[PDB]
Ligand binder design. Structure first.
Ligand SMILES: COC(=O)[C@H](Cc1ccco1)c1ccncc1
Length: 130
């Protein structure tokens, strides 16, 4: 229905706004663009599904997310990729891990405050009907 297409349009507006707020935070610059395959050729041998905030913006506009749950699976993948690629005790690895945890925690805290639980349940029930 037109009403259901208005629901998904409001979801995309919400997700673009959350993503922009994460992408401008200086702590998260390391998560804004793909890891460059020239500078780091080893990356794509270890990390089998790369993800970053520019790719998330492109996915919103391709209508890849019908629920906030499917958006948060890609925020969780950004964070888990950084934890698995940089697991060591040295300061460089510990700094990215702390930033990855802060990107995940910050996204979940904006959603807990600003997403209405009945708006998410509506998106889930339209998705489950298709
Ligand atoms: C999302 O970025 C990463 O996982 C890279 C891994 C990387 C790049 C070069 C060598 O290793 C990283 C970038 C900056 N600081 C720590 C790690």
């Amino acid at each position: 229905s037109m009403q259901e297409e208005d629901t998904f349009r409001e979801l995309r507006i919400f997700l673009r706004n959350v993503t922009h707020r994460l992408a401008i935070d200086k702590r998260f610059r390391v998560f804004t663009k793909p890891v460059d395959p020239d500078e780091v050729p080893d990356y794509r041998t270890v990390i089998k599904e790369p993800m970053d905030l520019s790719s998330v913006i492109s996915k919103i506009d391709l209508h890849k997310y019908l629920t906030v749950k499917d958006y948060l699976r890609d925020i969780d993948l950004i964070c888990s990729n950084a934890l698995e690629y940089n697991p060591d005790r040295d300061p460089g690895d510990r700094l990215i891990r702390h930033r990855a945890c802060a990107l995940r925690d910050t996204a979940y805290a904006i959603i807990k405050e600003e997403l209405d639980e009945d708006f998410e349940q509506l998106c889930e029930e339209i998705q489950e009907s298709r």
